[PDB]
Each structure stands twice: as C-alpha cells, then as structure tokens.
Amino acid sequence: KTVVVTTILESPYVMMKKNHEMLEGNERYEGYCVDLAAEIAKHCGFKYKLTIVGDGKYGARDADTKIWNGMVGELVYGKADIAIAPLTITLVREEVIDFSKPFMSLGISIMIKKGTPIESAEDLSKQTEIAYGTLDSGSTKEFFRRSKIAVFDKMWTYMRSAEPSVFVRTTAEGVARVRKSKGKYAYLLESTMNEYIEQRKPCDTMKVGGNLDSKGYGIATPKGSSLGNAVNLAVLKLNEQGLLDKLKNKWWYDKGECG
Amino acid sequence: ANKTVVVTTILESPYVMMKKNHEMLEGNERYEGYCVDLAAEIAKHCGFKYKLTIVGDGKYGARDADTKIWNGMVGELVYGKADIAIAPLTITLVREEVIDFSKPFMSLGISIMIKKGTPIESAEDLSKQTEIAYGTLDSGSTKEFFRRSKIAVFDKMWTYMRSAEPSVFVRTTAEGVARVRKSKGKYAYLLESTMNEYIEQRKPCDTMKVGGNLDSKGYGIATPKGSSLGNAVNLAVLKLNEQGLLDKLKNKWWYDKGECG
Ligand SMILES: N[C@@H](Cn1oc(=O)[nH]c1=O)C(=O)O
Numbered sequence A: 001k002t003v004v005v006t007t008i009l010e011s012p013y014v015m016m017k018k019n020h021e022m023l024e025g026n027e028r029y030e031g032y033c034v035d036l037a038a039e040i041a042k043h044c045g046f047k048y049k050l051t052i053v054g055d056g057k058y059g060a061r062d063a064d065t066k067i068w069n070g071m072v073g074e075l076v077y078g079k080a081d082i083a084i085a086p087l088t089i090t091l092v093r094e095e096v097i098d099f100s101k102p103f104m105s106l107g108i109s110i111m112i113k114k115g116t117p118i119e120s121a122e123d124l125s126k127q128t129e130i131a132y133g134t135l136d137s138g139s140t141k142e143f144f145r146r147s148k149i150a151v152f153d154k155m156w157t158y159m160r161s162a163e164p165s166v167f168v169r170t171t172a173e174g175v176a177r178v179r180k181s182k183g184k185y186a187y188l189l190e191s192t193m194n195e196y197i198e199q200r201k202p203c204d205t206m207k208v209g210g211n212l213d214s215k216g217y218g219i220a221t222p223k224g225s226s227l228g229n230a231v232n233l234a235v236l237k238l239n240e241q242g243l244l245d246k247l248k249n250k251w252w253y254d255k256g257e258c259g
Numbered sequence B: 001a002n003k004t005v006v007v008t009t010i011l012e013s014p015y016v017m018m019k020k021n022h023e024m025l026e027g028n029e030r031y032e033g034y035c036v037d038l039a040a041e042i043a044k045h046c047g048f049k050y051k052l053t054i055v056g057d058g059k060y061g062a063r064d065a066d067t068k069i070w071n072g073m074v075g076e077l078v079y080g081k082a083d084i085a086i087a088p089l090t091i092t093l094v095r096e097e098v099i100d101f102s103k104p105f106m107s108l109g110i111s112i113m114i115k116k117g118t119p120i121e122s123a124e125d126l127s128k129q130t131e132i133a134y135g136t137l138d139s140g141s142t143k144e145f146f147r148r149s150k151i152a153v154f155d156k157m158w159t160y161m162r163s164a165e166p167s168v169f170v171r172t173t174a175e176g177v178a179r180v181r182k183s184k185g186k187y188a189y190l191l192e193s194t195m196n197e198y199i200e201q202r203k204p205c206d207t208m209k210v211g212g213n214l215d216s217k218g219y220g221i222a223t224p225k226g227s228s229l230g231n232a233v234n235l236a237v238l239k240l241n242e243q244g245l246l247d248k249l250k251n252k253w254w255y256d257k258g259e260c261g
C-alpha cells in the first residue's frame, strides 16, 4: 500500500519546484523534507505520496469543538499515515500522535527588520511602539499562551489583545509583515525558519537574542502505528550517517544569497 | 503492586556527584547533581519511589563484539538489573535497538577540549598533525562515532586513535580532563559539548572548548524494551522542558556556580 505523507508548504522544507505546473505527483515538490521523505521511505521500504495539508496549518486543538486541525488532525482522523515536516514535538501532540526522535533542533527566536531597536524578548515586552506576533495554530503561539514566565506571560497578554491582529496565517506572511512594517513589527518564529530567511534577499531581516527554548522536529505517525518503529530507527541512522547535516547545509547555507 | 524503582546512573559531574558529607548520608541523600534533581522530578511526575544506584562497572554502555554482551548502564537495563536509567546517556541507533529512550532532555554534540594555548581549533586541525595526541572515553557513543564514521576526517582520526601508543582512550571523563591538564598541550580530548562546557567553568580554568560540534544528538531517559514506565517518563520529560525546568536545572549545575568568572 502507498503511504500517504502529509506535509506543509514551508520554505525550505517543502517548496513548489519551478515549472511545477507541468509536473505531477511527488516531482512537483523540492526541499529538506522532500529529500528526507525519500530517505525515510528508502530505509523503511515503502512507496509514498506527498500531499500538502488541506487547511495549511501545523496542528492545534480547538478549545471548543476539541477537534484537531492541520497535519496533526490529518493523522488523528486517518487522513494521512505519516507526517514529514517541521512539526514540533510537544506534550499535547505527543498525547494523541507518536513522534520519532527529533531530526532537527530549534527554539523560538526573534526576527526583526535590520536596525530595529530590539535585542531580546524582554525588550519587546517593555515597549509598545514595536508590535509583535506569531503564527496561528502552531507550537509557538501555544508557548506564550501556556507560559508562566513573567516576560513571556506579559508578551502573551499583549498579543492576544493587540489591534490589529498580530497573528499571521503563514510564516511567509509574518516575514512579509516584518519587511513592510518599517521596523514597527517583530515576528516570533522558530530559529530554523529565521536563520533561513536571514540568508535570503533582500537580506533585510535578522535574528536577535538567544532562543527562548530548546526542542525539535519529529516525524509523526498515528498513535500506535506500525510504521513508528522503523521510522524512528531510520531518523537515528540518517543522523548518525551525517545525512541530516548534509540536507541542512544544502537547503540553508548553500546558495547563500546574502551578505 | 507498586515497587521501588531501581535507577541506574553514573558518577559523572555535574549530573551525579557525591555530596560533601556523603558519609553521614545514606541512600539517595548521598548524591547531588542535574540528574539527581531530574530523577526527583520524573519520579514525582510519574508517581513512583526509587533507589539511585551507581552502575557497577562505571561505564555508559557498549556491546562487546564477539560475545555480544552489553556493559555499563545499557547492560543493567538489558539484563534486568535496573528498571530505568537517568543519566547523560546518548540516544543512539544500536542502543535504541535493545532499549527504549524518552525524547531528549538535553542536547549535545561531540567536541574538542584543549589546554589553553593549544594550537588547535578544529577536528581537521587534529587530523593533520601528530604532535598533539587525542582520544576519547571508552565504552561510549563518542568512541563508537569515530569507529563507525565514513566521513574522511573522522575516519582518519579513528585510524590514528585506535592504534596510538600509549593508549589515547580513558575510562572516565575525569581521567581525560587530567590528561589534558597535565600534558603541556600535547593531548587534546574528544568529549560531549555538555561535559566540555561544564569543565570549562571549573578551576583552574585551564581548558577550553574549540570549534563547532561534530554532530547533534541528545540524552534520553532509558528503560528496558517494553517497560510500562516508558510512556509516562517520556511525557514527564516533555512537560519538564516546556515548563522551563530543564533550562533552569542546566544553569543551576553549569553556570550558577561556575568557578571561572
Ligand atoms: N513547527 C511549528 C509551526 N510554527 O513555525 C514557527 O516558526 N512557529 C510555529 O508555531 C509547529 O510544529 O507547530
């Protein structure tokens, strides 16, 4: 049986190849997770079909309906057999789906328009001139909503009531907002996307401060899936062979169009 | 029928260390450290009583080629001598094949420790010279890394280390640190970044971590394959990290009382 892989269009993990309109199937995409999927499948011995998550979200649980959306939802409801994307390993998710050991490390970080008067999260919380938000339906937003740390708590109180909305539908939108806000908007996103955007034209953004936390991305499968074991061992072998580092260098620093 | 959980761990600073008056203390009270605190937090969150026991052979864990017998903490789990391992045990493929690991509670990578002033800033530097000797810890993931690497530079380093005389391998991290400190810069030690940065903050502040890490991995809490404690332990680790506890514990044992400024 062909394995259904749910993923999300997020640079440089999964992107549409140039001329993708005349391409079909898996050949339409390119990126770190596209290469990763190939390696995993190769090591686990299964054929697969890449599909972009329907609602374009990562995965959150609606406090009301208590339904899961994004990639997490597709795994939970049997729409997909596995998730191969920059999906953050978290407690709430781990309670409904399984995660392989992490294939990449990261932490929430700050992205600013070059020249912006901000060096840390604490800075952002002390001022009101510069707005700041996060992605929706993701682990970053949850981070602030559940944080009991003074600074983060303060930032959350501000963000959930900010007007206009400081939350964005996609990372691209958060980035575009920073670039077009003349420094009046700072975006909170994972260090991985941050450092990637940092090395791309027009090279007008940069990462400031340390990471707010430390965690990783994991390949996810429906709770109690037979693929779980082989996938986990595959991630470990790939990391030990140095493949994960090669892929990281290939989609991140190689083609460094910035200075 | 709830029973006291046997925790195998290892005397490795600052994860597990003997308290000052350890001889006036008994049981778990004899020890202090990052993993001692971690054990308490996990036990609390999972609701179990435990007994900390230092691994007999003082090794992390390796499979003897030929007899296929595992030693160290990994062996304690495999042969049922312990119920769980709470220590800086590196999550690796060969180990995950015989025991279970929770998600990472700490991140690290192999690194280089030098005596200050030593003319080395990378693994490549080490591989192109013979004046400065270098080695790793025995029965661990670092030695296995070089032994199994297909990467040119690392293969070259392993080829040199495995046959150097006298032996460049040490039985304990402490022995490796001593060798770096007393060898006038003629010895460089390969060890995990975590131990490296801890030592860098200890007197007499004569060692330094140089270059980036050779890899990126983590430490996990290990349990015998199929253990019932597995699930709860994994979740506990995740909750602790999200609460910021783990970041707090590392600063406590690494920097809060650093001895080098
Ligand atoms: N990897 C995140 C998605 N997301 O990307 C960011 O940069 N922030 C954020 O929430 C997830 O798995 O929910």
Ligand SMILES: N[C@@H](Cn1oc(=O)[nH]c1=O)C(=O)O
Residues within 6 Å of the ligand: B060, B061, B088, B089, B090, B091, B137, B139, B140, B141, B142, B143, B173, B190, B191, B192, B195
């Ligand atoms: N955590 C390592 C033990 N060890 O510590 C080092 O610094 N190198 C090394 O092999 C393991 O689990 O085998």
